[PDB]
């Protein structure tokens, strides 16, 4: 969370994209019954929310 | 339907027979449609005869 604040906005924006790609893949593996560590999904969702919160704070 | 100068308008009260039976009625104001200029521009508005009595535009 503080580590996110060390990054630039553009750098944060890139981290979001990466997390959204990850979240999509998790949901895809979950659907095909190949996930196992199902707790990752919640982690990633929160992370994305954290990014978007920091960015909105910047403005 | 109301005097623009005053605010005269319909008001209710009783009609009474001999025998004093009561029934609801109104008293309308004696409103007349006339051209005046309350605001700079003239316009046809309801005005009471009473309001016209004396000094109004027309």
């Amino acid at each position: 969370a503080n580590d996110i604040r060390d990054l630039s906005t553009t750098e944060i924006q890139d981290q979001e994209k990466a997390l959204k790609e990850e979240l999509f893949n998790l949901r895809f593996q979950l659907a095909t019954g190949q996930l196992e560590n199902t707790a990752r999904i919640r982690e990633v969702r929160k992370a994305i929310a954290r990014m978007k919160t920091i960015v909105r704070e910047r403005e | 339907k109301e005097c623009v100068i005053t605010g005269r308008k319909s008001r209710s009260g009783n009609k009474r027979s001999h025998a004093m039976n009561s029934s609801k009625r109104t008293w309308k104001a004696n409103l007349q449609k006339v051209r005046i200029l309350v605001n700079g521009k003239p316009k046809k508005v309801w005005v009471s005869a009473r309001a016209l009595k004396s000094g109004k535009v027309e």
């Binding site: 790609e21 895809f28 095909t32 | -």
Partner: protein, 90 residues
Amino acid sequence: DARDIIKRPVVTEESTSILDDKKYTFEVDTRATKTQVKYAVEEIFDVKVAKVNVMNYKGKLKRMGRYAGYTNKRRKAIVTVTADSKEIQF
């Protein structure tokens, strides 16, 4: 964004039977037009989409001990890729 529009793949006897026919069945956002689904699938999977067919499923009424209610309404998109296009895996 594209990964909002495409929710998850659909894995059923029916959905799995048409994978060999290069038809991929997805559950997509209920507001997504078949045009948005075409461009989303191309962004996500790097494929050439030939046609997208789409259908709305109304919620199914389910009981659980004197409490009744509807499952989610779904929008199902079948995406046919081109002959030359690379496959999606599942």
